[PDB]
Coordinates of C-alpha atoms in Angstrom, one line a residue:
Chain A
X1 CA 6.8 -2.9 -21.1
X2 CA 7.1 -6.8 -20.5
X3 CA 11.1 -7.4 -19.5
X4 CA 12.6 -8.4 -23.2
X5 CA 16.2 -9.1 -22.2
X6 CA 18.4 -8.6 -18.7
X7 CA 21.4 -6.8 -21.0
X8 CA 22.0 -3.1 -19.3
X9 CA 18.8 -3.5 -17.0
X10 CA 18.6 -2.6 -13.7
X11 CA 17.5 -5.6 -10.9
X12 CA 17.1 -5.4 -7.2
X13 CA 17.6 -8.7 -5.3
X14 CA 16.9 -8.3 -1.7
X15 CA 18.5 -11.3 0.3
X16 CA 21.1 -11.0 -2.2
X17 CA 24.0 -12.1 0.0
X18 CA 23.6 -16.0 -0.1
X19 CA 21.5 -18.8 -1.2
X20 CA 18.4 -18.2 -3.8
X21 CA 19.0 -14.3 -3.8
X22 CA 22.8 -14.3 -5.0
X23 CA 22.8 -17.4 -7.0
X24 CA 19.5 -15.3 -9.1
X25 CA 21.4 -11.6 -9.0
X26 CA 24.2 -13.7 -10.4
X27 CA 22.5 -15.3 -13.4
X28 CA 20.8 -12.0 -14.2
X29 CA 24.4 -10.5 -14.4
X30 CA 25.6 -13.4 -16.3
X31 CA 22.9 -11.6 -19.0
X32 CA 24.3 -8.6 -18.7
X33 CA 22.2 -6.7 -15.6
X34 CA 23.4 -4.0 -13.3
X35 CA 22.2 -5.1 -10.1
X36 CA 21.4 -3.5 -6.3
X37 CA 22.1 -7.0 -3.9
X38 CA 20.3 -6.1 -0.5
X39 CA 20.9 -8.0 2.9
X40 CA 21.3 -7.6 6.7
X41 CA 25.0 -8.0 6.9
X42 CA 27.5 -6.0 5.8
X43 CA 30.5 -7.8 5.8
X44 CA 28.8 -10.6 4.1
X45 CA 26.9 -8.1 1.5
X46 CA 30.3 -6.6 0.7
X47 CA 31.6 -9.6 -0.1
X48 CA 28.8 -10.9 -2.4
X49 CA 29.3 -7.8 -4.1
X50 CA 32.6 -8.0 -4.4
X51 CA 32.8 -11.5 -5.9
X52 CA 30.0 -10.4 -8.1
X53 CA 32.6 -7.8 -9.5
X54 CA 35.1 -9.4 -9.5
X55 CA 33.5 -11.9 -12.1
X56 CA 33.6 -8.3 -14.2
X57 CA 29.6 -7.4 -13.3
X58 CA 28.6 -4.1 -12.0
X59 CA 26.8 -4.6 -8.5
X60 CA 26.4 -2.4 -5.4
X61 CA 24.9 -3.5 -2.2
X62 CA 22.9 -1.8 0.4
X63 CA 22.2 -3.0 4.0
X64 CA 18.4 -3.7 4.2
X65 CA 16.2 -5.7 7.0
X66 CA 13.0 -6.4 4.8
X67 CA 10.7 -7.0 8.0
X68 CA 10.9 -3.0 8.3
X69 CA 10.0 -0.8 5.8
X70 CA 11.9 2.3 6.0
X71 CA 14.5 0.2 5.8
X72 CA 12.4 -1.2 2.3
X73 CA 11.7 2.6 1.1
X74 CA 15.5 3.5 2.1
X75 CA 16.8 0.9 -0.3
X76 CA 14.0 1.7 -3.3
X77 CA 15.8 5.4 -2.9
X78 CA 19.3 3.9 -3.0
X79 CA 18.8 1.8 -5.9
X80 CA 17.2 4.2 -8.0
X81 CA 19.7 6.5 -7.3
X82 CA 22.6 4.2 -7.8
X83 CA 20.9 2.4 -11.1
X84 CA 19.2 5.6 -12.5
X85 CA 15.8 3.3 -12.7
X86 CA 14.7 -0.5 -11.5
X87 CA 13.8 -2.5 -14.0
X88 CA 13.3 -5.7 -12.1
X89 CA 13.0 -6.4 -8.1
X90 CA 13.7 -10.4 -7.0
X91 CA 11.7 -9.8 -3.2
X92 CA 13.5 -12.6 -1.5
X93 CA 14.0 -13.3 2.3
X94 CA 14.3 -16.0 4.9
X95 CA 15.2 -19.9 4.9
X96 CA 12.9 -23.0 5.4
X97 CA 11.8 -23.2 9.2
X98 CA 10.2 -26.1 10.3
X99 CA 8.2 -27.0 13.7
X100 CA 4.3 -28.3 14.5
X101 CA 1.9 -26.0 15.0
X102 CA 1.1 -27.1 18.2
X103 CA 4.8 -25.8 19.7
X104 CA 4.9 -22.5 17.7
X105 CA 5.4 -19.8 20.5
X106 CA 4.4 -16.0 19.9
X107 CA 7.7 -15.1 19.3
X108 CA 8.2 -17.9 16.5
X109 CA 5.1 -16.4 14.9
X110 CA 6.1 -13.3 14.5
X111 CA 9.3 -13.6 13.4
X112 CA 8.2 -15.8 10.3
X113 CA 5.6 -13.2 9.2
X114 CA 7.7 -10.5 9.3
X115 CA 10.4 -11.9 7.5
X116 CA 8.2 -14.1 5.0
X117 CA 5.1 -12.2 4.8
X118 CA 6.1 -9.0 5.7
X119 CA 9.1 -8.7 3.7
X120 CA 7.3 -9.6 0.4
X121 CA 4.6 -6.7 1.1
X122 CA 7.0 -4.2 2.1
X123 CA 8.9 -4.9 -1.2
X124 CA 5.6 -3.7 -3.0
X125 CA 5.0 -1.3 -0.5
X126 CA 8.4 0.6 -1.5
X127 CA 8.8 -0.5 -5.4
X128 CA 5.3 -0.9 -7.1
X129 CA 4.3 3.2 -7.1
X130 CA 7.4 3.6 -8.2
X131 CA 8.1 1.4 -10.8
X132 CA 4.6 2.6 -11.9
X133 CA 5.5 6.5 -12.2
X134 CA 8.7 5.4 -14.3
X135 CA 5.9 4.2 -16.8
X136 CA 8.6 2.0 -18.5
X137 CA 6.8 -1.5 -17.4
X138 CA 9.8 -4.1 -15.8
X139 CA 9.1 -7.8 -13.4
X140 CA 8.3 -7.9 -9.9
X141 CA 9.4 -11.9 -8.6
X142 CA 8.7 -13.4 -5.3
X143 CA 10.4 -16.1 -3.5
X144 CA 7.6 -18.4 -2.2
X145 CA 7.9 -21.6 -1.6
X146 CA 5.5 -25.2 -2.2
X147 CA 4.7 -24.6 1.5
X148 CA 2.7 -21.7 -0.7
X149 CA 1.0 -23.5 -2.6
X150 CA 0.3 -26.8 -0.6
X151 CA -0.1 -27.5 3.3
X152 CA 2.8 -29.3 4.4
X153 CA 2.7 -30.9 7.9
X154 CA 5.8 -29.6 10.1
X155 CA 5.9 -26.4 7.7
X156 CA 2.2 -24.2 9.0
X157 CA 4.2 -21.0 10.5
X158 CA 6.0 -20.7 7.5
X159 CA 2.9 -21.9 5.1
X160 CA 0.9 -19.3 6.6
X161 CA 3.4 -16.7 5.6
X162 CA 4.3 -18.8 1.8
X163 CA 0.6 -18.6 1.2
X164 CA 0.1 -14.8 1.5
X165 CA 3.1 -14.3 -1.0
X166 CA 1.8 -16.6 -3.4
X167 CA -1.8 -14.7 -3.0
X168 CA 0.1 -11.3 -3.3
X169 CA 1.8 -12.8 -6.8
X170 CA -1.3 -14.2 -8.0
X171 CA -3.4 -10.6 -7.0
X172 CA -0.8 -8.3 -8.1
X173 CA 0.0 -10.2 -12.0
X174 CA -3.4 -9.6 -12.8
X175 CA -3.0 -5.7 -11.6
X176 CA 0.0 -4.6 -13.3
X177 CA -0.1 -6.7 -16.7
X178 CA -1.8 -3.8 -18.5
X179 CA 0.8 -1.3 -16.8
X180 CA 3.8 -4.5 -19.2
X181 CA 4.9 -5.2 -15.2
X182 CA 5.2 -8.9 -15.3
X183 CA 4.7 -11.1 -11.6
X184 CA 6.7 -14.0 -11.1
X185 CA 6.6 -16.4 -8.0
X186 CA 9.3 -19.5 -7.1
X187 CA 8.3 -22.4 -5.3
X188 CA 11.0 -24.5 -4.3
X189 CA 10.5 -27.9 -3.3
X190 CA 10.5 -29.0 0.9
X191 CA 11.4 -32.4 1.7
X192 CA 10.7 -34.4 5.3
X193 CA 14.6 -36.4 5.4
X194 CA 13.5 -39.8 6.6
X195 CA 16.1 -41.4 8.8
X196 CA 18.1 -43.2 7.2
X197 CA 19.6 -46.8 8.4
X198 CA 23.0 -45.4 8.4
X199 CA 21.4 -43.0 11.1
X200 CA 19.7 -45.0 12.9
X201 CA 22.3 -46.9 13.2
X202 CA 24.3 -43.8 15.6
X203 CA 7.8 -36.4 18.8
X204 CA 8.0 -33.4 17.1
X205 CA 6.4 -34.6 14.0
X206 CA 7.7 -34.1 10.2
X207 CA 10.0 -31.8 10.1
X208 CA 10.5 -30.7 6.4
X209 CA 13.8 -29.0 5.3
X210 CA 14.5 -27.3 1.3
X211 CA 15.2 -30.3 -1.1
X212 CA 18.6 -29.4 -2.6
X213 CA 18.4 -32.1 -5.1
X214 CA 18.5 -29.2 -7.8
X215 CA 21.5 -26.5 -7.7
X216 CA 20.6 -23.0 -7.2
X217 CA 22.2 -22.1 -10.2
X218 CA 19.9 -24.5 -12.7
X219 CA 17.5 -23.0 -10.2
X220 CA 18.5 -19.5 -11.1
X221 CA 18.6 -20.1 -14.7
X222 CA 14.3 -21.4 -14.8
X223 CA 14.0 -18.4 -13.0
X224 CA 15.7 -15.6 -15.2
X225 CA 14.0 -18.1 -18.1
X226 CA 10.7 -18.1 -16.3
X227 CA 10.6 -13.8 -15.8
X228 CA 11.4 -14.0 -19.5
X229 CA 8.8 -15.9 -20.4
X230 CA 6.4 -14.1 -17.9
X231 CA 5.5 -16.9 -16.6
X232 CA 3.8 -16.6 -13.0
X233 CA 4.9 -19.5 -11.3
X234 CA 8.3 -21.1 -11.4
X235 CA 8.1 -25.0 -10.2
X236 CA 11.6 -26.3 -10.1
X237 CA 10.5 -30.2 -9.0
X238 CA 8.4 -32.1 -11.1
X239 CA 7.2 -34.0 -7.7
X240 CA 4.9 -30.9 -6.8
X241 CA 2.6 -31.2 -9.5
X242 CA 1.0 -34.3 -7.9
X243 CA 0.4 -32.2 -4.3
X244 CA -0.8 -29.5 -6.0
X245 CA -3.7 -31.4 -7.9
X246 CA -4.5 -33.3 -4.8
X247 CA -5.4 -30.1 -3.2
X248 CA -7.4 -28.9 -5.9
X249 CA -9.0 -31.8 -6.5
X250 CA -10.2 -32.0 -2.6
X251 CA -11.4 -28.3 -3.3
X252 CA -13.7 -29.5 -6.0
X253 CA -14.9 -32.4 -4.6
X254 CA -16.2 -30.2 -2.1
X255 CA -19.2 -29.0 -4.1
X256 CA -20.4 -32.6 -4.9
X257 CA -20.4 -33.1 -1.4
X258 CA -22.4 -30.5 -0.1
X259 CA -25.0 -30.7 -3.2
X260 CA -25.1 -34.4 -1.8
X261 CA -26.2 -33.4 1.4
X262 CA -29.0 -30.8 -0.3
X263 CA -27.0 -27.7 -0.9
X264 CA -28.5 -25.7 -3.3
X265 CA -26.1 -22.7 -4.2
Chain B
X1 CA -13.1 -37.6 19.0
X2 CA -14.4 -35.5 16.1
X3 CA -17.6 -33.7 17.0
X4 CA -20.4 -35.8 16.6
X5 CA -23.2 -33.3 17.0
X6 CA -23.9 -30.0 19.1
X7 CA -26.3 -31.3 21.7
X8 CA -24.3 -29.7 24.9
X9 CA -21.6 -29.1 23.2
X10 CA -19.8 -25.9 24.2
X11 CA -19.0 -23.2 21.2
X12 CA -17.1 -20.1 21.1
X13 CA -17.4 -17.6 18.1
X14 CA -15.2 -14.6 17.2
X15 CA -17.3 -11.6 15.7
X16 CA -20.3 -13.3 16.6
X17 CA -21.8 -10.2 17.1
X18 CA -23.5 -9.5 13.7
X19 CA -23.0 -11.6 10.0
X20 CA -22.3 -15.0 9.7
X21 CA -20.6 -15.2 13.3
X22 CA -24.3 -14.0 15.2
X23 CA -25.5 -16.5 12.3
X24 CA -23.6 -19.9 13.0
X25 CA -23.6 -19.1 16.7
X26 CA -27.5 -19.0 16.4
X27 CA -27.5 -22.3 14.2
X28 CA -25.2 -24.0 16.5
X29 CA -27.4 -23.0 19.9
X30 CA -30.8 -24.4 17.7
X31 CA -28.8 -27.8 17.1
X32 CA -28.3 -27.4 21.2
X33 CA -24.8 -26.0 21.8
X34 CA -24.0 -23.2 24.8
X35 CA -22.3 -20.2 23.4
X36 CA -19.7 -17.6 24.0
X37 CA -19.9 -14.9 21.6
X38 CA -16.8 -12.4 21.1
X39 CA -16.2 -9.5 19.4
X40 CA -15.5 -5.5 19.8
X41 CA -18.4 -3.8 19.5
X42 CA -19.7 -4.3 23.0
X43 CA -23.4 -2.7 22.6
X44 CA -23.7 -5.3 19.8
X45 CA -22.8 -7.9 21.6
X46 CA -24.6 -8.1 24.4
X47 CA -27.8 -7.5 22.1
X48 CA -26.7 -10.5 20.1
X49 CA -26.5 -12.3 23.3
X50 CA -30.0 -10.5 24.3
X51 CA -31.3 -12.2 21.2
X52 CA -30.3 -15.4 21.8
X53 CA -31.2 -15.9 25.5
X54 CA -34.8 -14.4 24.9
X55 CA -34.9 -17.5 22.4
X56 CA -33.8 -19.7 25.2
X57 CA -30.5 -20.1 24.0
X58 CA -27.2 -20.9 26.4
X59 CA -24.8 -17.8 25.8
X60 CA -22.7 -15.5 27.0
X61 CA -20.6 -12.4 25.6
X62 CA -17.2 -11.7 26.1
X63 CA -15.3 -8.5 24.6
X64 CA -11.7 -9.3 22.6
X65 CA -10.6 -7.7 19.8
X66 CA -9.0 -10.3 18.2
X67 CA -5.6 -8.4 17.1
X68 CA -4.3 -8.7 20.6
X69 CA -3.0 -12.2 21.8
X70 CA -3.6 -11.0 25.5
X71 CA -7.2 -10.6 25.0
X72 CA -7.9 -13.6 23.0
X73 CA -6.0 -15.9 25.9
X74 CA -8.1 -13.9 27.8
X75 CA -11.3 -15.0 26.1
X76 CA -10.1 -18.5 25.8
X77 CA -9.7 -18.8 29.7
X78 CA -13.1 -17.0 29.8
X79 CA -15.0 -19.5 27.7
X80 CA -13.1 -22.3 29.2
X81 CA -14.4 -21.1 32.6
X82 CA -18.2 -19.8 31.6
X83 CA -18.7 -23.0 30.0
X84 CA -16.5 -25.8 32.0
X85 CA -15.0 -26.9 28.2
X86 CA -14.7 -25.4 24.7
X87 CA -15.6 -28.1 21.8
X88 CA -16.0 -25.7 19.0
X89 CA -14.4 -22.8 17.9
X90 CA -15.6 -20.6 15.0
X91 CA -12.4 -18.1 14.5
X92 CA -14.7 -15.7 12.2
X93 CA -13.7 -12.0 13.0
X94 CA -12.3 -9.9 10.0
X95 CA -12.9 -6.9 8.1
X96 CA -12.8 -5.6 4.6
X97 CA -10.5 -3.3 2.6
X98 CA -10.7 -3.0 -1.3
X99 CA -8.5 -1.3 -3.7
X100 CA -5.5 -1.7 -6.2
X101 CA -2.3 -2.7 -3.9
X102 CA -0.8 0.3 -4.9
X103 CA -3.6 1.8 -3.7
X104 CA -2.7 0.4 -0.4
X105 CA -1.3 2.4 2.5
X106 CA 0.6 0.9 5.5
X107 CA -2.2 1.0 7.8
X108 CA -4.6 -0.6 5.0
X109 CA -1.9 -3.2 5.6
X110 CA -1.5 -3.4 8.9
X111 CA -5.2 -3.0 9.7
X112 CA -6.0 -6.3 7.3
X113 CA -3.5 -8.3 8.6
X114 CA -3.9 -7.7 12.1
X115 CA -7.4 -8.7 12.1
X116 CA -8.0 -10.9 9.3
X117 CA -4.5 -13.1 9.8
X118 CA -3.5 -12.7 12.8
X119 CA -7.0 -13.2 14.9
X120 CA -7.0 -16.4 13.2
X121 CA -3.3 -17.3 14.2
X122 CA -3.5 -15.9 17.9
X123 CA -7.2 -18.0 18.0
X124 CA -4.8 -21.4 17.3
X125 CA -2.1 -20.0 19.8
X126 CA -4.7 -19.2 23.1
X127 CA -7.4 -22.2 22.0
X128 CA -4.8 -25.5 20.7
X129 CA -2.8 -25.9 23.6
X130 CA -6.3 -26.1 25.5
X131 CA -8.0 -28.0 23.6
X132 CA -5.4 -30.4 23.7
X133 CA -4.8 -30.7 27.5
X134 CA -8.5 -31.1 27.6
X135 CA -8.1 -34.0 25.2
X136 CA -11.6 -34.6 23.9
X137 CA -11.2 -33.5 20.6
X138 CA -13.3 -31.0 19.2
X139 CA -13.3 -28.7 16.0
X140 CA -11.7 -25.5 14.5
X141 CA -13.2 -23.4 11.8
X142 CA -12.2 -20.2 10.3
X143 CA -13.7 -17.7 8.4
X144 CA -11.5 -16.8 5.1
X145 CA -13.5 -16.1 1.9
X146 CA -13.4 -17.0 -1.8
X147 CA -10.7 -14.7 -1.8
X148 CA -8.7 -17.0 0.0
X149 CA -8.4 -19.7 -2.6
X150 CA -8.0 -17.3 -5.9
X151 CA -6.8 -14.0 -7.1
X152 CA -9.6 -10.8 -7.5
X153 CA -8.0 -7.3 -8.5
X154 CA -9.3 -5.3 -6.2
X155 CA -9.1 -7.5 -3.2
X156 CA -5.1 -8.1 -2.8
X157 CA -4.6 -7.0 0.8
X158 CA -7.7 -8.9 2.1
X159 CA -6.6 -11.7 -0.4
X160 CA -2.9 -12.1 1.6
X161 CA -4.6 -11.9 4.9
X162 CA -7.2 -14.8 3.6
X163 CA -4.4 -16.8 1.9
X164 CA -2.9 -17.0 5.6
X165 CA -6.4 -18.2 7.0
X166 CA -6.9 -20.8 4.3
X167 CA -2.9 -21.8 4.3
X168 CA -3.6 -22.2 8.3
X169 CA -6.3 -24.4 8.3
X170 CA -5.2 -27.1 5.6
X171 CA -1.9 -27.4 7.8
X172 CA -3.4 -27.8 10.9
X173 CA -6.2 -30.4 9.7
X174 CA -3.4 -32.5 9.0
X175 CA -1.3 -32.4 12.0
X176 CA -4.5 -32.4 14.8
X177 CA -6.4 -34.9 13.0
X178 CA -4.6 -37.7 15.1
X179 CA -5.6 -35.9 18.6
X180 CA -9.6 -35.8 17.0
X181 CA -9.9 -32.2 16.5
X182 CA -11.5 -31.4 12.8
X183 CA -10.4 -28.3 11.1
X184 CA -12.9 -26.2 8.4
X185 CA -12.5 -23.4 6.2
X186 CA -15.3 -21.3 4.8
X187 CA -14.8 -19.5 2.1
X188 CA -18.0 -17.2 1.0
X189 CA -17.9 -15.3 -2.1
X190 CA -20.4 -11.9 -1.1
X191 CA -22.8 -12.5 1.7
X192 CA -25.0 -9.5 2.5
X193 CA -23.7 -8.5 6.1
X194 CA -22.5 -5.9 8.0
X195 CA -18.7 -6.4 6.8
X196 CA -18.1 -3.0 4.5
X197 CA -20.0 -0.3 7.5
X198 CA -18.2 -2.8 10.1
X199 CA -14.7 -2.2 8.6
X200 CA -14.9 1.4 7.5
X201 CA -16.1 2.2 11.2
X202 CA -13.4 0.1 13.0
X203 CA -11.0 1.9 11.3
X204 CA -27.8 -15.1 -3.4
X205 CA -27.1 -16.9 0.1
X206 CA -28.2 -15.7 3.2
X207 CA -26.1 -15.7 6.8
X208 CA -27.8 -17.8 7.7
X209 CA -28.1 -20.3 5.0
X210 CA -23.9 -20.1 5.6
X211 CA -24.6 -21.1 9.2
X212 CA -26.5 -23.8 7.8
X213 CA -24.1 -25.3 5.5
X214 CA -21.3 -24.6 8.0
X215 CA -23.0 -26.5 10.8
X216 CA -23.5 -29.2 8.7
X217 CA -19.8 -29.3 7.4
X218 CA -18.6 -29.4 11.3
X219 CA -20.6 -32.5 11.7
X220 CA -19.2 -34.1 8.6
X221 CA -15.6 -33.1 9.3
X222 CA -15.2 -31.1 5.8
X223 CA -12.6 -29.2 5.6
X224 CA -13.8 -26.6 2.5
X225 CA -17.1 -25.0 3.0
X226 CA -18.1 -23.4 -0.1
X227 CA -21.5 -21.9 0.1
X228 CA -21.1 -20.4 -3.6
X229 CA -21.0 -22.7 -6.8
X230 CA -19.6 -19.7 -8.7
X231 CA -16.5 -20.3 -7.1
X232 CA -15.5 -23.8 -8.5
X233 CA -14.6 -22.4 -12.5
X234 CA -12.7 -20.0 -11.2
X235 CA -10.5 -22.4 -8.5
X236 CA -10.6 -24.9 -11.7
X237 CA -9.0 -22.2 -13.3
X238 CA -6.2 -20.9 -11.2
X239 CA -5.2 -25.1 -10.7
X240 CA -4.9 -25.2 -14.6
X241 CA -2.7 -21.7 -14.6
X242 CA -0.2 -23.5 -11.8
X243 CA -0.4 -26.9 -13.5
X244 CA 0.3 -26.1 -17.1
X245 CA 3.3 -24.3 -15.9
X246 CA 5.2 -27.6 -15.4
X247 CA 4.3 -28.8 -18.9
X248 CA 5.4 -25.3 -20.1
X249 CA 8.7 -25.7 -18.6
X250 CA 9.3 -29.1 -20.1
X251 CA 9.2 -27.4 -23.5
X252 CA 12.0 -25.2 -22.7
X253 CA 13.7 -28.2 -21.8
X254 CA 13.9 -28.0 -18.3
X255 CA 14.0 -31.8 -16.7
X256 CA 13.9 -31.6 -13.3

């Protein structure tokens, strides 16, 4: 049941309206997919929509908060109704916030784990038993982020919340596989913008934003490629591989360690 | 300053009324440190802190169920006030819930999260900002498991919530490290405990061999503690998964 082409599939791309969400429904339209685009707003969903038609793709959008999920199970409804099945769901919420740990008030915390935690489990929540009673297999994909798979100073709100998706992506691949539903997760890159001299020119610690060195639709592209391929993770910058060993390797180390001390187990 | 040994030191430990919390709050009063031990069920905890005081032990009890940011401010001003300071704090609550995700109903969901994530993030939010204004350093640990650092079928809903806990910690070593406060994370594959009964009813390597090695770990600022062996193929082999992915890439021809 692994996904074998996007030509007259069905895919749902929550946070479909801008950034990482549109510039993916787009690509997977570019291959020939019907799509569902859900967002918060619907002026601006209307007009994502309508662009994406007006390229000569078939899209409908539905107005969808993903931090609550009757709003998530209304939108599963709507898009199997509209698309006569779901072949693929893109969960995708939220933007890069930064701030240190230390200043994170209640109210910053809970916002970032509904909309970055939250809205990835409610997307499985509302699509998984039903993409498994359709029996027909399809691609769940996740947007993440390296703050998911790495501990980025000036990024742990939003690190706590990248780090259960990326769990929930790992977890759920292994599930489904033998039900042919593939897992996908995208980590884009996060970048600290030194000041530069020019700046300088005219205390709350690192503040990392998203590196845009990469365009969201090359982006877009390793990720249609990626879901293809079934491949779990989708790495756009070549400079994460270096973090992410570093953190493993401080994991393993770990065990010599202890033995060192006279661990036994 | 990083914590340099328990002798009077001051410790505070959520769901130290049974498991591995009852265990490292017990290892850290033998290595001389005076206690406060949370949790929610209040007849076990105050015969946890029976225990300890008829061995001579420093402690107290103080009720918080660690899902509500009011009560675990509370217990922070509590332990604060019982025991003039707080060095160490052992954020260890949690529960269990197993099962296929699809499996998974909303208050499975909510039920993990609540306890397992967010009693770890609301223990940061009522015990950072104190520990800093008392600016002696001191140490946070927090329970997550092995299911924290990889994927188990069976275990996805604990796995997010323990994700979050392990994500947590590796961020905040970093950032408190310059104010002396040392951050750990222990991460137990099974433990015989309480945990399954515990978690049905709120809704190998002993405990105290964990309390041993976590003790230990405290004193040597590590920020992994990872009491099974077992567990080091299978992190090797989730790295590998994630690495090979950029080489896999390449030979589609992606280049950035």
């Amino acid at each position: 049941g692994f996904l074998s082409g996007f030509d007259g599939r069905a895919a749902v791309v929550t946070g479909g309206a801008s950034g990482i969400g549109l510039a993916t429904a787009t690509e997977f339209a570019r291959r020939g997919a019907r799509l569902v685009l859900s967002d918060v707003d619907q002026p601006a969903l209307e007009q994502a929509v309508n662009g994406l038609r007006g390229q000569g793709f078939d899209a409908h959008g539905v107005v969808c908060d993903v931090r609550h999920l009757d709003e998530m199970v209304r939108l599963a409804d709507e898009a199997f109704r509209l698309l006569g099945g779901v072949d693929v769901v893109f969960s995708n919420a939220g933007i890069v916030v930064a701030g240190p740990l230390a200043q994170m008030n209640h109210d910053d915390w809970r916002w970032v784990i509904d909309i970055d935690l939250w809205g990835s489990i409610h997307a499985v929540e509302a699509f998984l038993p039903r993409l498994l009673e359709q029996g027909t297999g399809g691609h769940i994909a996740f947007t993440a982020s390296f703050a998911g798979l790495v501990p980025n100073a000036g990024l742990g709100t939003y690190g706590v919340a990248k780090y259960g998706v990326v769990g929930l992506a790992e977890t759920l691949a292994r599930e489904v596989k033998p039900n042919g539903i593939g897992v996908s997760v995208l980590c884009p890159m996060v970048v600290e913008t030194k000041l530069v001299s020019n700046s300088e020119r005219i205390a709350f610690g690192p503040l990392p934003t998203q590196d845009e060195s990469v365009s969201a639709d090359d982006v877009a592209r390793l990720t249609a490629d990626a879901i293809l391929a079934n491949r779990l993770y989708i790495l756009p910058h070549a400079a994460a591989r270096e973090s992410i060993r570093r953190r493993f390797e401080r994991i393993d180390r770990t065990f010599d360690e202890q033995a060192a001390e006279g661990w036994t187990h």
